[PDB]
């Protein structure tokens, strides 16, 4: 059976990217994190303190605590037939803001702005629902300067 150390099997997971080692750029620390925000976990091997466990690498969680240089995150973990909301204290260097939630917030902002503008201007309430791409509509194609080319299968050729 396998050994049950903390960093077993993380040879490539905790390694830096090629031609990307060295000093950590400071936007990582300048980024603002607030309780309730969503963040992705990607371990940075260069910082051995406050590392997340390998099972949370590449997972998204929600911040519930903001300390001096770390954050408490609630991450869903599958254990048999239940999903446990585990709490982990991860340092900033292993954390990155998640863009899915900010995109949704932008969409909600746009929805509210469009609704308010239409209501103020007296227009009907516009459609504010994402719709699956519908089947292509009817159209016409012209062959002018685009005459059809007759295609046929090619014979087999011995390519030595």
């Amino acid at each position: 059976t396998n050994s049950k150390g903390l960093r077993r099997g993380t040879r490539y997971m905790f390694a830096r990217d090629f031609r990307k080692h060295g000093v950590e750029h400071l936007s990582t620390y300048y980024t603002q994190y607030k309780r309730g925000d969503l963040v992705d976990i990607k371990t940075n091997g260069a910082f051995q303190k406050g590392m997340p466990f390998k099972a949370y690498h590449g997972r998204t969680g929600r911040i519930f605590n903001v300390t001096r240089g770390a954050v408490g995150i609630i991450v869903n973990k599958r254990v048999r037939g239940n999903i446990l909301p585990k709490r982990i204290n991860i340092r900033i260097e292993h954390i990155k803001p998640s863009k899915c939630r900010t995109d949704f917030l932008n969409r909600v902002k746009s929805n509210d702005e469009k609704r308010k503008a239409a209501k103020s201007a007296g227009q009907p309430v516009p459609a504010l629902k994402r719709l699956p791409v519908a089947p292509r509509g009817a159209h016409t194609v012209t062959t002018q300067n685009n005459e059809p080319e007759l295609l046929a299968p090619l014979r087999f050729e011995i390519v030595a």
């Binding site: 605590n65 300390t67 408490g72 609630i74 037939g81």
Partner: protein
């Protein structure tokens, strides 16, 4: 009479038998494990806000 025989054959089926239970929605409301200093300040703030 070898008797180690570990496997994970039917475990996913057993887990999905009753459905995979997602976490509740009130877990984000508790302030368990939050900074002691922040909790102290929050307690002071809540103790003093005038109802009307």
């Amino acid at each position: 009479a070898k008797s180690k025989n570990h496997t994970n054959h039917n475990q996913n089926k057993k887990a999905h038998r009753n459905g995979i239970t997602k976490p509740k929605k009130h877990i984000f409301l508790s302030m368990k494990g939050v900074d002691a200093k922040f909790i102290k300040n929050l307690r002071f703030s809540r103790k003093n806000n005038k109802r009307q």
